[PDB]
Each structure stands twice: as structure tokens, then as C-alpha cells.
Amino acid sequence: KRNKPGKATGKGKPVGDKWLDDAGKDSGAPIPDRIADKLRDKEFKSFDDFRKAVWEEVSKDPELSKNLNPSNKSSVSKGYSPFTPKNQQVGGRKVYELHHDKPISQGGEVYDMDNIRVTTPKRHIDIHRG
């Protein structure tokens, strides 16, 4: 289902400067409302294509991008996920990861931004653990 086309939906939430700090805690950080406004109703061939669009929009957003350093700004400008702080990295997983709150395996929506969270590798592994 991650590789079937869908249009992006949902509202997201207001965020601040600590947006990506929240990705290491609880259920992760929300998709920002400002990002949801840009991506709603666009069609994506796959979830990977959506992921790329998220980071490109972050690169272009003057409130979200200001809290990334020059090297991380370069990364998001390419549509790559930015690098997390070292202690949130796990092996070769060193960048922020998108997470579905209601699992896709359980009929969770792939492209509904209200069902998506931004996580660090460490937090993402821990959420799925059980």
C-alpha cells in the first residue's frame, strides 16, 4: 500500500522551534500545519515521493528551516531527511524517519498527514518495540 498512488490529506498541527526536538519523545512530532497546507491534494506515486516532498517543503519554509544549521539546510534542499543529534542515531539510521501512528498493517492511512509523525531512529525503534 506504501507503493500505490494517493493524494495527501489532513491538517497537521502548529509547531515551534523545538519541532524536531519533539521527534525524540512520545509518539514523535506532528506534520506542521504549514507543510500540510502546501501538500494537501497533491498526488504521490509512493510514500517515498511524499517523504521527499516533506523535506523539500521544510527547506523552503522560513520558520522551519531557520532551526537547521547550514549543512542540514543543504541536505533538506536536496529533499533528503536531515541528520539527528548523535545519541538519537542507531547504526546506519542517522536521519529523521516518518512514522504512521495507526499502523499501515492495521489499515492506517498512508498519506493522511494527521496519521504521520516525525521521529528519530532511536524513538522510532522504541515505539515499534513491544
- Binding-site positions for Zn(2+) read 99, 124, 128
Nearer to Zn ion, 99 or 122 (CB): 99
Cβ atoms of residues 58 and 23 within 8 Å: no
Q: Is 99 in the site for Zn ion (CB under 5 A)?
A: yes
Give me the least distance between CB of 119 and other proteins, in Å please.
16
Helix (H, G, I), strand (E, B) or coil at 32: strand
Nearest CA to 102 out of 92, 110, 94, 90 is that of 110
Cβ atoms < 10 Å from Cβ of 10: 18
Grid cell digits, residue 117:
509523525
Helix (H, G, I), strand (E, B) or coil at 122: helix
Is residue 63 annotated as a catalytic residue, yes or no? no
Residues near other proteins (CB under 8 A) are: 69-72, 74-75, 77-78, 80-83, 85-86, 89, 92, 94-95
Residues in binding site = 99, 124, 128
Give me the least distance between CB of 20 and other proteins, in Å please.
11
Residues forming the site for Zn ion (CB under 5 A): 99
Enumerate the active-site residues. Answer: 2, 93, 97, 99-100, 124, 128
